[PDB]
Symmetry: C3
Subunit: 73 residues, 3 copies
């Protein structure tokens, strides 16, 4: 194995391209994860909203039951 200069030249080239190509894969996956998270934060914020809506309806029903429990008497 008299491993030469032009050979290591090529080994360096291809090694770097590999490591770079693998990096890029991780970058892409990372970008798609970011996007999933933006979507999930939105779904959580929408659920928060729905629940705000039920808090209000619940306030209303507690008031309507009050009116009736008292009027009944």
């Amino acid at each position: 194995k008299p491993i030469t200069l032009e050979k290591l030249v090529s080994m360096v080239a291809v090694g770097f391209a590999e490591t770079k190509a693998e990096t890029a894969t991780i970058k892409a996956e990372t970008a798609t994860i970011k996007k999933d998270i933006a979507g999930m934060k939105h779904d959580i914020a929408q659920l928060d909203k729905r629940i705000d809506g039920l808090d209000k309806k619940i306030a209303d029903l507690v008031d309507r039951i009050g009116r009736v429990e008292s009027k009944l008497d």
Copy 2:
């Protein structure tokens, strides 16, 4: 520092292995993040479900209060 060919050979080897090993760490973390997100999307979908259940119960109570408010009169 008469930095030689067989020396850079070794430096190239170990450098690449490093960068590769570090890459693999990022890949693994990325995989565990993916899995956390799959779980979180499921928890959000289950919360959506629970809330669907409360929407229905709320429809029911609004109807039962109606029956009584009117019958009372």
Copy 3:
């Protein structure tokens, strides 16, 4: 292009530093993604809590309507 030993020495150095610097960027982004997820798991757990609170209020209103529907008769 009589590409020499000291030249590839430099190319190796700078290539590695690059790939290392790019790696570090991915690591940082990965760390901030982890942190977003810790926050999102907390928001989901808090929503779970809010809903536990509405389950209880709903139990209460179903009981109060019961008392009245029956007393009315």
